Amino acid sequence: ELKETPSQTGGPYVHIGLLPKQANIEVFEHNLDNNLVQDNTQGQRIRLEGQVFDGLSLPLRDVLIEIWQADTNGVYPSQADTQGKQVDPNFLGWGRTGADFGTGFWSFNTIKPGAVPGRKGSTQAPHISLIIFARGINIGLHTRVYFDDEAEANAKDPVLNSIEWATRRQTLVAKREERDGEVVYRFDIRIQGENETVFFDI
């Protein structure tokens, strides 16, 4: 029985290895980014944005974020997906981005995920798995993003209901809002203090 390699903070320069462009380094021809929508990707395009705040309510300007989600039909572009359904052939399902050094805002251009099957024949409400890495953070923090215009589905969601402190459930619900013509979901993450975002051990 081997033990898992121990985690360490990503450190302040986590952008050199994970987002060379943002560090002004051009070594890779194909760079990974925060845009999960391709030409023929199916589903309604949405923009996910927000900020991450520390214990002083100050945004982290050196944080790195990644998301993992299913396609428009709730199927993951992964061999581990055992649904038997065909996945959108034009969807990676993953993306990475960093907050702005100045303002602290982060965002992803993606698609709204479809409902995914839960354990024991249940159905999970639409969600996006998100992880946070940064200086001061020893282990990547896991969380989930749900959508407020999906209230009926959230009320029945297994994971959200596994949080006995009902009042904390709302911290995982992003607020929809139509900008010019694009749909944007605002999701702010609070690491400490009041309205601290729920973090999971998955």
Partner 1 sequence: IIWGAYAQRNTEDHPPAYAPGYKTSVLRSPKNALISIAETLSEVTAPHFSADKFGPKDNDLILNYAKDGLPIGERVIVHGYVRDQFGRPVKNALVEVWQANASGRYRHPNDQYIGAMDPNFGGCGRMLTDDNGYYVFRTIKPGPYPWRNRINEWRPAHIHFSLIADGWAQRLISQFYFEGDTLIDSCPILKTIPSEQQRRALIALEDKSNFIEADSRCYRFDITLRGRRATYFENDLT
In the region spanning residues 49 to 78, those forming contacts with its own copies, defined by CB under 8 A, are 56, 58
Q: Is 144 annotated as a binding-site member?
A: no
DSSP per residue over 4-54, as a string? PPPP----TTTHHHH-GGGGT----SS---SB---TT--S-EEEEEE-EE-
Q: Tokens in use for 8?
A: 């360490």
Q: Does 162 engage in binding with its own copies (CB under 8 A)?
A: no
Q: What is the DSSP string of 98-160?
A: E--TTT--EEEEEEPPPPEE-GGG-EEPSEEEEEEE-TT-SSPEEEEEEEGGGHHHHTT-HHH
Of Fe ion, its own copies, partner 1, none, which one sits near residue 167, judging by CB under 5 to 8 A according to partner kind? its own copies
* Cα–Cα distance, 202 to 193 (Å, whole number): 23
- Looking at the chain, how many residues does it have? 202
The span of 78-86, 147-155, 165-173, 178-186 binding its own copies (CB under 8 A) equals 165-173
Shorter beta-carbon distance to its own copies: residue 25 or 200: 200
Binding to partner 1 by residue 134, rule CB under 8 A? Answer: yes
How many chain residues are in contact with its own copies, going by CB under 8 A? 5
Query: Looking at 13-21, 42-50, 104-112, 176-184, which segment touches partner 1 (CB under 8 A)?
Result: 13-21
* Closest distance to partner 1 from the beta carbon of 12 (Å): 6
Q: Work out which of 21, 42, 47, 54 binds partner 1, going by CB under 8 A.
A: 54
Residue numbers belonging to the annotated binding site: 135
